[PDB]
Design a protein around this nucleic acid. Structure first.
Ligand code: ZN
Lengths: 122, 86, 52, 50
RNA sequence: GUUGACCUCGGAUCAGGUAGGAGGACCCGCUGAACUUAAGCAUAUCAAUAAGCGGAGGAAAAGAAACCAACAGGGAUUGC
RNA sequence: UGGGCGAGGCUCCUUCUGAGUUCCCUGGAACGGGACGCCACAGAGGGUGAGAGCCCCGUAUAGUUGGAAGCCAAGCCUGUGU
RNA sequence: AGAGACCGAUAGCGCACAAGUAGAGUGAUCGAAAGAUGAAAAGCACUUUGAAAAGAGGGUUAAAUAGCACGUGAAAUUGUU
RNA sequence: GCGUGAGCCCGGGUCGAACGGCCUCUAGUGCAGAUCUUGGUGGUAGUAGCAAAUACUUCAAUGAGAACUUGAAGGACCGAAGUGGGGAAAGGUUCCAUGUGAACAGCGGUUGGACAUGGGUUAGUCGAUCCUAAGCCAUAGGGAAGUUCCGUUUCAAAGGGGCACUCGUGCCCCGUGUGGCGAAAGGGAAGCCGGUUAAUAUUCCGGCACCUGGAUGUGGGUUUUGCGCGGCAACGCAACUGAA
RNA sequence: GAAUAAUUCUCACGCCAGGUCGUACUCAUAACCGCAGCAGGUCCCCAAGGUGAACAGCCUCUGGUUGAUAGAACAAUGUAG
RNA sequence: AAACUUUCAACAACGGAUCUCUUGGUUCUGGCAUCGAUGAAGAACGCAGCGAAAUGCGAUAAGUAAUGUGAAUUGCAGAAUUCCGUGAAUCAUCGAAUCUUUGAACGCACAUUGCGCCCGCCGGUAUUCCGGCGGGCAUGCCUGUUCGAGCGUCAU
């Protein structure tokens, strides 16, 4: 046959994506039965079919992740894999609001005597 | 001693180790003579500089640490570029 | 052996009486499957694309 | 011996697998310098470490 | 007697968290030699060094005087 | 002694850039020798069948096409004493 | 990332090459040798002797005094004249 | 050809891409020796030598080529504490078939445990898996600056059994004790005969059997004296309630 | 826990199931260790006939080999008898 | 007189010096600060139309998605695309995924592909037995919740 183009795979639902995967896995095994003691243009079909299964598998996984992320919006606790992964050291630094707090007596001085803008003439 | 006594050698002091793959696991002692298994630390000493370089970082696959420099250059961003399809 | 018997029934709808397995020197597993007496195996080999 | 373990059984398969000569069409590539397999092991010459 | 508190000490696959390992050129500590020199050698020297052990960062450490001075007095720390 | 706007400038990536294959001799092949020209804020370097500024990639100068996120800031608009 | 009054394959790092590889040791550990055909494979069709390896003609090339034991090919040692 | 000398210059042959004179600067700057370092090559030399384990011979076939390939017929040795038939440790494809130039088999080679291409190892019953021995290591605790040393029932609040609920989540008993690893020769539930393949079988095929675990029905037995009869006895039989 | 059936009968017959890994070949004057196709070293089972006190020595049957570089001559000196 | 030994030249041998080359070393100067229980460094086994090694990747396995460029790859074969748009490549960039067995390594162990427990679904007459699939069960410490022990102790 031919490739399964990724262009039209995006405008599908989950069920028909799972259906197409059914035949795709089928004849790959069936065609492997008779590949022995023969070799021709059919050898291009195994490399054709193997990659075709890969494309649809990624699409199904990607579609599930996007919809799952919508569910956990506006939630305090969300699963580990959906949390951002930056670095072990970067996940334990103080937040911006915590590191910017100041004491009440320090703010009083900074309000009335800040750094001024000045110039001195020759 | 000599050839006559060399024929009596059909036993094994050491076997394969689960952490370093070398045949340096004492059967009776149950400790590896190269990587220090089952201790948490890995054996390493400063009186031999050649031994340290034989198992230093960067002599293997580096499955995860090899892609970090590229990620830092872009500032550890997430998302997709503007109007990508998907 | 339990998984092998299940796979054949779901994929080639053939029933077996017993399965014997061994591991070849190269590192692959080879399994012998014996079919029930009423079913014929010679024709199943032909009709299931097995080279005959 | 006849009594073996799966770890030793697995290890002997790979050692035998990577013991056959190079395919013929390798030496016909452009800019090739490989002449022969330099890691040939024979059971009467070299003793592999289990 | 019943019942309700306080203090101390425990159980749980209770809810949420955190430490180990790698690297160790540079940096903060502990521990600690002998070869060698003295034309011998024991105090001394090599040396408050090599090896061994613990703990961090892109720098670390130090730091706003229980200081230096004896002057007509200087004024946190680090480096040349 | 609060708040809000804010030109303009600076960092990063990406589009584009001058001039001989003229004539003769040796040679398997001119990138060699001789004659005649051109460019140059560009005669650093490399390739092309032998030493190439003008065959090709690049090199010098300020501009130019498009895009993302942070800074700085000329100068303006409004409350007010428990 | 940019450079040098640095080395030019017994030099320069142990490694200019499938080098911490092949190999040795029960083990801790020890650890080499090895770059260059031609601008382009155009890597010798066909005939003939031979059981075969190969030889003699004949071909490609500017050159086979460049034939995958291949640029230049010194000395020790050897053959013929 | 020049110079006392270290050295310089030219003629002829081979080869194929860079190189000199003159004044200053700079250094990893000049080899016969060090039982010097690495690589290469001679005389000795076609020499020493290839002599333990009793021993070979005739015809035919294959082939370019046969003392050490194959068949037949003679002659010999090992002589059941074997040069026979099978195993543990160790080796790791050495097993079987077809083909073959060089190299190896200290002579040869058509042959090979060598080279090239393919194939081959089936288990409820044979082993591992289970239990402990000498011994090793966690837990409670105490030392040590520390890597870690001791400790194995010890100055410890240390466990496991049953039932019913629509539903897990509710009840009720006992309590001196409470870990793991460690044997292919120790302890241990169960398979025998015949045939079969170029190469495996107590496994494959045919026949005839056994053990454990889990569910359930018929036959027979017992009971209205509710849980069997006989023999003086040693005891017998197809069964014949039994928790802590 | 029964008098009209019930049965916790270790009796006979009948129904279902039994996972995982090893299994080729040598075990030695050529397949393991001694730098090697080395007169060395390396744990067990089975055990025929005659002579004879006998697993002593000598000959034979089943089974297994005929494999250790060869041809010609017979001085000295040697090793063994 | 030959043979033999020695010296020189010509050509032919053995061996790899000399001359020329270099996608490699060495030293100095300049810029930056980024591993890991959200499973690191290291180890094992696998994947190609024809592969042993190196390089790359993990049963989605000599790669997949997305963006850019704009016609290849090449030892052989085969097709693929052909720029209408539905897009070659061991291309460049990289913001979404997969990621076997191990390793600080974490149910108990390991010289064994060994032996267990809890919860859910699907089969065999099955809450208890057998099989398949998915999710769990290490230690020290902090905050909070909950259930408890003791004439340590307060009031009826
Ligand atoms: Zn180890």
């Amino acid at each position: 046959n031919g490739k399964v183009k990724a262009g039209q795979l995006w405008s599908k639902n989950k069920e028909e994506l799972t259906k197409i995967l059914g035949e795709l896995k089928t004849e790959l095994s069936q065609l492997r039965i008779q590949k022995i003691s023969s070799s021709g243009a059919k050898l291009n079909k195994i490399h054709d079919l193997r990659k075709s299964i890969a494309r649809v598998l990624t699409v199904i996984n990607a579609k599930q992740r996007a919809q799952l992320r919508l569910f956990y919006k506006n939630k305090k606790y969300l699963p580990l894999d959906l949390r951002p992964k930056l670095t072990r050291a970067l996940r334990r630094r103080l937040s911006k609001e915590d590191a910017s707090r100041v004491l009440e007596k320090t703010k009083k001085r900074l309000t009335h005597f800040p750094q001024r803008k000045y110039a001195v003439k020759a | 001693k000599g050839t006559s006594s060399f024929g009596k050698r059909h036993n094994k002091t050491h076997g394969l180790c689960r952490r370093c793959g070398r045949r340096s696991l004492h059967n009776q002692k149950k400790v590896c003579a190269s990587c220090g298994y089952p201790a948490a630390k890995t054996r390493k000493y400063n009186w031999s500089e050649k031994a340290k370089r034989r198992k230093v970082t960067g002599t293997g696959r580096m499955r995860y640490l090899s892609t970090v420099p590229r990620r830092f250059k872009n500032g550890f961003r997430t998302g997709v570029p503007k109007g990508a399809r998907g | 052996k339990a998984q092998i018997k299940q796979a054949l029934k779901k994929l080639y709808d053939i029933d077996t009486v017993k399965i014997n397995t061994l591991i070849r020197p190269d590192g692959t597993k080879k399994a012998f499957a014996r079919l029930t007496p009423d079913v014929d195996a010679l024709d199943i080999a032909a009709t299931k694309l097995g080279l005959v | 011996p006849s009594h073996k373990t799966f770890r030793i059984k697995q290890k002997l398969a790979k050692a035998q697998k990577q013991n056959r000569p190079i395919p013929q069409w390798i030496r016909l590539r452009t800019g090739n310098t490989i002449r022969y397999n330099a890691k040939r092991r024979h059971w009467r010459k070299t003793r592999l470490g289990l």
